[PDB]
Amino acid sequence: AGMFRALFRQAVEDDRYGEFLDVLAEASAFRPQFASPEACSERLDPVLLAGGPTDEGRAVLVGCTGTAANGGPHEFLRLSTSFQEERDFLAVPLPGYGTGTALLPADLDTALDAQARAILRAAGDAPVVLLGHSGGALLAHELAFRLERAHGAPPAGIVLVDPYPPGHQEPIEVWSRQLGEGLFAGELEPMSDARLLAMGRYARFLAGPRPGRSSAPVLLVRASEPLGDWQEERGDWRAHWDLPHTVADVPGDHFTMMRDHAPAVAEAVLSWLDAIE
Amino acid sequence: AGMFRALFRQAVEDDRYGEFLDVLAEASAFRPQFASPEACSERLDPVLLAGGPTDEGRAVLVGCTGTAANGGPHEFLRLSTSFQEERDFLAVPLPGYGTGTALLPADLDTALDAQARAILRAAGDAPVVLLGHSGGALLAHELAFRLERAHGAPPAGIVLVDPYPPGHQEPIEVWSRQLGEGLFAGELEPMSDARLLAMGRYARFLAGPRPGRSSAPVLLVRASEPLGDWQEERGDWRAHWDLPHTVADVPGDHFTMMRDHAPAVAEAVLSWLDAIE
């Protein structure tokens, strides 16, 4: 399709994923934006992917879509099947990826607020537990902090699946070629240039300094196999979070933990949710 | 057309032409390149646009295509008609703008060597006078120096039409909006994203330090009208070259000197050529 995808393919071929993500971030400043949560063009209505049991007061799980330009509403499909008959699971879209092409958020807080309003409509009064994978894990925690402080609705918990926060990103930078190759392997259609610009823009959002820590307890779910090669002498390659409530290790790598081994992730989540309520 | 064009249009509207030319330069690093003049994909066969009188040892004019993404083989068409029955006029393409998409040069010297070899073939035994406008004027001079220094064959002269070399570009920045608007106004079809990356790549080449100075005599041709508003207390808005052999002023501004007033440009060239030989 478009030139950004062709350039990005070349960048991954030449092992320069990070350099090209910076180009996408810079280019993204020239796309139409939205600066107030109200100015948002898309409907961020969460999609119900699994139903809980017929009852009460139980937490609903909200999946926070990650930044992958090849992603979208299919991200949590495999995982959600293990929640059927256990928990409601809602998937909330990320602003800037839809349709027409969606406006990009002016800053992260503008996108988080538009998500927070959509989640509060769909969840009604049930307690909310957020879940995210990789960059979606970072976004789930930033959203949890936004719901606390700007919307007076603190979530009951956060599930961070393989997060690599600023200061602990080194292994995911070393494996950046595998991230890029996984984006192309995961194409169900050619990544549009609009979505690659969204991906670059959110990546830069989530690299910045964001000191707030949510008060909600954190479940840290970690892959057990490394995504690529790794020298023992470089230390621990694993995902990381500061002071998690619970830590769970599941089979698979950064990618296959949410595919072939998604049931192991679901079981860690379900046990944790029962414990904390 | 493509996303780069739409981004560029937005950048011009927001008075950010220069910042977006930098995004194009950075992005252009991920296009396939050629590193040897042999490895150049397209053939740089110079096109004969006007023929001189049939007789000897008269110089032929070589038009050095400029950097504008909206340019190409039409650039010298109205200028060349005034050379018919006076001087051979050849237009040499600029590598990376053609065709399958054209390979970009690894550095400016690589592209200049490719042009140098096509020109030496096409000109045969005739002395050569190089001519260029705006960014093409900077390229004409760099080509003149390459021919003298690396190929041992200095041209008989250089015609620089409205050059703004590094160190003398304050008007080019003050008028950046008008330059961007003149690019879109000059479109005969939509600027392709490949040509926009070519333009950004050559613009960065021409911003870098290039110390070599040609020993060929220079005709400096300047526009007489300012392209935009300019407080004369700043200094001179006009085009500049150090130690020109001759200076000629022609009607029109930076753009209209070459369309509406090309005959005035041609007449200054033809009179200068007779003088130096």
Query: Domain holding B123: CATH number?
Result: 3.40.50.1820
Instruction: Note whether A2 contacts B: Cβ–Cβ < 8 A.
Output: yes
8 Å CB contact of A194 and B7: no
Structure tokens at B6: 């739409």
Distance CA A95, CA B70 (A): 34
Among the partner residues B3, B16, B30, nearest to A193 by beta-carbon distance: B3
Report chain B's terminal Cα–Cα distance, integer Å: 48
8 Å CB contact of B26 and A30: no
Q: Residue B252 gets which letter from DSSP? A: S
Determine the 3-state secondary structure of B221 from DSSP: strand
A91: distance to nearest CA of chain B, Å? 29
Residue of chain A whose Cα is closest to the Cα of B26: A23
State which amino acid sits at residue A204: R
User: How far, in whole angstroms, is CA A167 from its chain's centroid?
Assistant: 18
Distance CA B178, CA B17 (A): 10
Please classify residue B100 by burial: count the beta carbons closer than 10 Å to its beta carbon, then call 0-12 exposed, 13-18 middle and 19+ buried. Answer: exposed
Distance CA A130, CA A133 (A): 11
Whether B254 is catalytic is yes
State which amino acid sits at residue A58: R
Residue A43 lies in a domain: no
Indicate which residue of B28, B82, B134, B214 is catalytic: B134
Structure tokens at A15: 């092992």
Cβ neighbours, 10 Å, residue A38: 10
A54: distance to nearest CA of chain B, Å? 49
8 Å CB contact of A7 and B26: no
Q: Which residues contact A117 (CB under 8 A, 6 or more apart)?
A: A37, A44, A151
**A-chain residues near B3 (CB < 8 A):** 2-4, 193-194, 197
Name the nearest CA neighbour of B151 among B114, B192, B205, B199: B114
Q: Residue B163 gets which letter from DSSP? A: -
Distance CA B66, CA A65 (A): 46
Distance CA A249, CA A238 (A): 10
B26: distance to nearest CA of chain A, Å? 7
What is the phi/psi pair of residue A254, to 5°? -45, -40
Residue B186 lies in a domain: no
Distance CA A94, CA A205 (A): 13
Residue A88 lies in a domain: yes
What is the phi/psi pair of residue A160, to 5°? -105, 110
Report H helices in B124-169: 135-149
State which amino acid sits at residue A200: G
What is the phi/psi pair of residue B213, to 5°? -115, 125
| Pair A63, A76: CB distance under 8 Å | yes
Instruction: Note whether A16 contacts B: Cβ–Cβ < 8 A.
Output: yes
Distance CA A53, CA B110 (A): 69
Q: Residue B56 gets which letter from DSSP? A: -
| Pair B119, B128: CB distance under 8 Å | yes
Instruction: Note whether B10 contacts A: Cβ–Cβ < 8 A.
Output: yes
| Pair B22, B200: CB distance under 8 Å | yes
Residue of chain B whose Cα is closest to the Cα of A195: B3
What is the phi/psi pair of residue A34, to 5°? -135, 135
Distance CA B193, CA A4 (A): 9
A137-to-A62, A65, B199 alpha-carbon distances in Å: 12, 9, 40
Distance CA B215, CA B213 (A): 6
Q: Half-sphere exposure of residue B26, counting CA atoms within 13 Å on the CB side?
A: 17
Among the partner residues A3, A8, A20, nearest to B193 by beta-carbon distance: A3
Determine the 3-state secondary structure of B124 from DSSP: coil
CB pairs under 8 A between A and B: 50
Distance CA A245, CA A273 (A): 12
Residue A44 lies in a domain: no
Residue A119 lies in a domain: yes
- Is A135 labeled as ligand-binding? yes
Distance CA A121, CA A31 (A): 29
Considering only residues 121 to 180 of chain A, which have any Cβ-Cβ distance to chain B shorter than 8 Å? none
Structure tokens at B70: 């909206």
Q: Residue B134 gets which letter from DSSP? A: T
Structure tokens at B3: 């996303």
Residue B223 lies in a domain: yes
Technique used by the depositors: X-ray
**B-chain residues near A10 (CB < 8 A):** 30-32
Residue-number span of the structural domain to which A202 is assigned: 3-31+51-276
B27-to-A7, A20, B8, B42, B198 alpha-carbon distances in Å: 8, 8, 13, 22, 10
Residue B230 lies in a domain: yes
8 Å CB contact of A197 and B14: no
Distance CA A30, CA A40 (A): 17
Distance CA A115, CA A100 (A): 20
- How many domains does chain A fold into? 1
Residue A197 lies in a domain: yes
Q: Residue B234 gets which letter from DSSP? A: G
Name the nearest CA neighbour of B130 among B173, B164, B163, B105: B163
8 Å CB contact of A26 and B30: no
Name the residues of A annotated as catalytic.
134, 254
3-class secondary structure per residue, chain A: CCHHHHHHHHHHHCCCHHHHHHHHHHHHCCCCEECCHHHCCCCCCCEEEECCCCCCCCCEEEEECCCCCCCCCCCCHHHHHCCCCCCCEEEECCCCCCCCCCCEECCHHHHHHHHHHHHHHHHCCCCEEEEEECHHHHHHHHHHHHHHHHHCCCCCEEEEECCCCCCCCHHHHHCHHHHHHHHHHCCCCCCCHHHHHHHHHHHHHHHCCCCCCCCCCEEEEECCCCCCCCCHHHCCCCCCCCCCCEEEECCCCCCHHHCCCHHHHHHHHHHHHHHHC
Instruction: Rounding to the nearest 10 degrees, give the CA dihedral for residues A225, A230, A234, A236.
Output: -10
This structure's resolution (angstroms)? 2.0
For residue B160, what are the β-bridge partners? B132, B220
Give residue for tokens 């192991």. Answer: A264
